[PDB]
């Protein structure tokens, strides 16, 4: 995995996660309303992942939630036709929870990954320099 590889630049590791979030597919034979109703449980689960310290899965899942209600679901064949009482509360939740939480998780992931990347590169540098010294000696 890209996101797990400490040698990979922190920005690419985070992008791999948001890419996985974006991959969510809309089933055109599920009524749009079911997606809106499911939003509550998706939010609950993303919160639980975060509280477990599973910030990668929390970040992926907020990205899915956002991708769904912002990008994919409005393209559903029955979307424009659908009467969705939940839409207002979903907009509110996107603003209150999903966006700011995902943004905060992004910052946290970047920070952790940067620490890992820095420490790794420092170790590998010292090792590579040692090898370069030894290849000179011989």
């Amino acid at each position: 995995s890209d996101h797990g590889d400490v040698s990979l630049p922190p920005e690419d590791r985070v992008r791999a996660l948001s890419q996985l979030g974006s991959a969510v597919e809309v089933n055109e034979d599920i009524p749009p309303r079911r997606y809106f109703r499911s939003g509550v449980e998706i939010i609950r689960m993303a919160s639980i992942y975060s509280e477990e310290g599973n910030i990668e899965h929390a970040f992926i899942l907020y990205n899915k939630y956002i991708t769904l209600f912002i990008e994919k679901l409005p393209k559903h064949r029955d979307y424009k036709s659908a009467v969705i009482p939940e839409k207002k509360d979903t907009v509110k939740k996107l603003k209150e929870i999903a966006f700011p939480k995902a943004e905060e998780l992004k910052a946290e992931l970047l920070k952790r990954y940067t620490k890992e990347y820095t420490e790794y590169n420092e170790e590998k540098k010292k090792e590579a320099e040692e090898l370069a010294r030894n290849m000179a000696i011989q």
Binding site: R15, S22, N63, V91, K106
Partner: peptide
């Protein structure tokens, strides 16, 4: 309803930033 669609559309750029 117009105002909700309009709110969703205004978050497109913010999603773009999230994915950056």
């Amino acid at each position: 309803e117009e105002e909700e669609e309009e709110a969703l559309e205004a978050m497109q750029s913010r999603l773009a930033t999230l994915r950056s």
